[PDB]
Design a protein around this ligand. Structure first.
Ligand SMILES: CN1CCC(O/N=C/c2ccc(C(=N)N)cc2)CC1
Ligand SMILES: [Ca+2]
Length: 223
């Protein structure tokens, strides 16, 4: 997260770190045994880390649970990033409390102008590289589809939206991938892609979660 703020320990209780020996992606806990992330975060040997603040220090509220299976969206295209969504099932159910909690799925899509909270342990620099150890947060508005498409001609599908600031300086970044965009207590987006980070006229592009609620629910119901 570039141009954001320190969230505070366990203030974003649905935020997960995906770990394969090191943090590589964020995710969102949607019930005691399922996490939603980006399909571009797919890999084998994922351990899900809940209750994290400093990802480099055991602080007392962590739950580390290995993934038993991952399900990439049936229509995920790695070249266009269309349908950039994946479900991850935990080997055992997480213990839910105030610091480790699921986030609600949307029942309808959010509108341009809605403020959302975007979070993760990704790069904090728009030019260099600096990875924070503690969770970072950014409040950002959803942008109009017209401004999104103008920013990224020929690349924005109906399963994507932009959020952030066309002036630059405030954005998600590498390492935030797969993490949450939460608007009025609902998971509306997943950190998906962008041109660099926090660049002028290049806002973050997010997976449009409301389009996937039917698939998420049916998938969970049978797996
Ligand atoms: C496999 N793999 C693809 C490249 C990189 O992922 N990049 C993610 C990303 C997310 C958000 C933004 C942004 N909001 N500007 C920019 C970039 C690392 C993971
Ligand atoms: Ca920790």
């Amino acid at each position: 997260i570039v141009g954001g703020y320190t969230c505070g320990a366990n203030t974003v209780p649905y935020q997960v770190s995906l770990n394969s020996g090191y943090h590589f992606c964020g995710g969102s806990l949607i019930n005691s045994q399922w996490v939603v992330s980006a399909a571009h975060c797919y890999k084998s040997g994922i351990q899900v880390r809940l209750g994290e603040d400093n990802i480099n220090v055991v602080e007392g509220n962590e739950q580390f649970i290995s993934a038993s299976k991952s399900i990439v969206h049936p229509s995920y295209n790695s070249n266009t990033l269309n349908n950039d969504i994946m479900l991850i099932k935990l080997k055992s159910a997480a213990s839910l409390n105030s610091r480790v909690a699921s986030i609600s799925l949307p029942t309808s899509c959010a509108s341009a102008g809605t403020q959302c909270l975007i979070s993760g342990w990704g790069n904090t620099k728009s030019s260099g590289t600096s990875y924070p150890d503690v969770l970072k947060c950014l409040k950002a508005p959803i942008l109009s589809d017209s401004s999104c498409k103008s920013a990224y001609p020929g690349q924005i599908t109906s399963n994507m939206f932009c959020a952030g600031y066309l002036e630059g300086g405030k954005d998600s970044c590498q390492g935030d991938s797969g993490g949450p965009v939460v608007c009025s207590g609902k998971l509306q987006g997943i950190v998906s892609w962008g041109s660099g980070c926090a660049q002028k006229n290049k806002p973050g592009v997010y997976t449009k979660v409301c389009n996937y609620v039917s698939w998420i629910k049916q998938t969970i119901a049978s797996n």
